[PDB]
């Protein structure tokens, strides 16, 4: 934690992955200009690293039901993790989750100490005191997949969480997805 690198204590993971959101209802109460009313809106994107697609319908007793085009808002990063979690595992069965490390930097592979977080609801390779990290190399414009065998120990809704940071850069991402443990 003075190494040419971020420390895990400081990596605040993304976590909020709605497949949808922004189900609001604004009102164009503004002073019309060229008959066109304009509303500046403030919106906090969601953590997910993907493309969002905003859809808008308008109704105006005068002009009727509108069907605005879709509109594209790409949220991206030059480095980020993919936690590829299946739909559902089965308590006491030992499967393999992938983490896909994406590096989009133009030119210069990436060293990353990527670190599964010690869950108590998992027989990971991680313990209260002892962590689980690899320093691993991802060429540029490509992805290194870093598997992780785990065992889901309690039923209901657990949470995987990964973390990676890159050396010499000070870039870093963390990612907390949840999956569904179902009993035998």
């Amino acid at each position: 934690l003075d190494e040419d690198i971020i420390a895990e204590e400081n990596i605040v993971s993304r976590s909020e992955f709605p497949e949808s959101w922004l189900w609001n209802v604004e009102d164009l109460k503004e002073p019309p200009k060229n008959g066109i009313s304009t509303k500046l809106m403030n919106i906090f994107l969601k953590d997910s690293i993907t493309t969002w697609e905003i859809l808008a319908v308008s109704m105006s007793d005068k002009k009727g039901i509108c069907v605005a085009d879709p509109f594209e808002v790409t949220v991206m990063q030059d480095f980020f993790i993919d936690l590829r979690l299946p739909y559902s595992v089965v308590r006491n069965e030992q499967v393999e989750i992938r983490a896909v490390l994406y590096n989009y930097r133009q030119n210069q592979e990436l060293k990353v100490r990527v670190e599964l977080l010690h869950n108590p609801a998992f027989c990971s390779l991680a313990t209260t005191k002892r962590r689980h990290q690899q320093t691993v190399t991802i060429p540029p414009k490509s992805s290194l997949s870093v598997p992780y065998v785990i065992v889901p120990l309690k039923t209901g809704l657990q949470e995987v969480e990964v973390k990676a940071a890159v050396y010499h850069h000070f870039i870093s991402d963390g990612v907390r997805k949840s999956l569904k443990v179902v009993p035998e």
Partner: protein, 84 residues
Amino acid sequence: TSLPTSNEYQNEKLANELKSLLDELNVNELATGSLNTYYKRTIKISGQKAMYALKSKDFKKMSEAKYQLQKIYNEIDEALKSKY
């Protein structure tokens, strides 16, 4: 004594610009509490950049970082204004 060299002057300005911020970092980090998770997620990484950058006494890392932290530091103000 006399006066410092070129490098010498610039280097010491950057640094004590930089420090100037790291000083009132903690105050900032603390305002994130109310703010949406980005802010926290962001400032923490920006904070370290600095402190390592500052200690590293290298111009690049130091300015580059000087700026990172500047941005966020005002991505906070803008935030807290839409809330009173």
